């Protein structure tokens, strides 16, 4: 992921 939010992590 990008690390930006849980769903993006």
């Amino acid at each position, epitope marked *: 992921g990008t690390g*930006a*939010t*849980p769903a*993006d*992590d």
Partner: antibody
Amino acid sequence: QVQLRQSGPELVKPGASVKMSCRASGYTFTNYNIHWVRQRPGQGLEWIGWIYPVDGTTKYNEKFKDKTTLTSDKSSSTAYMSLSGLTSEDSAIYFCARGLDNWGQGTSVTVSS
Amino acid sequence: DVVLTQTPLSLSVTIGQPASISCRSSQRLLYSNGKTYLNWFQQRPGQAPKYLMFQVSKLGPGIPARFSGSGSETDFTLKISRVEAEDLGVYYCFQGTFFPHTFGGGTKLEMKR
């Protein structure tokens, strides 16, 4: 060369709708969510929602849920946002973003008679 | 919803001098996995926001080391060790720990004269 290329400016009459596109390239489209963000003229940023291109799962800000539909087409690496039932409150630049790490250039919507 | 409060609204900076801006959260931002999803974005007017910092202190891709992030509980800080011309613009903090995700109101860095 990650790129999110958004469709052009839109002029919408009050009470109508708009559908805009976010064309992705330079990465594996199904490995990142596409978020959408609103910036009204002279204002800050508001998070609209995201879509996961693998399975079309979505998450919406409750504030935008009634007016907004997020879709995506894996085969064309393109995400879409439809906005329905607009007023001048919805005049804004709308950005898409790849997991928030790379943002499209924005699509302006002007809601006017 | 989480509300993020940024100070100052505007910061008059000088090339070569340090800068510091703050983001107060209305509640703690620790997620159940132990990570704190407080991020920073920089937007030059007329352009798209860029992913500057994530999870309080982790530099975004390609972001120079003159930027550093810190904080815990409800108070977070973004620092520039020495301001450069390209650092002018609007900086937004953002939280992704809770839905809906929310942005602070922005701090604009403008040139002192």
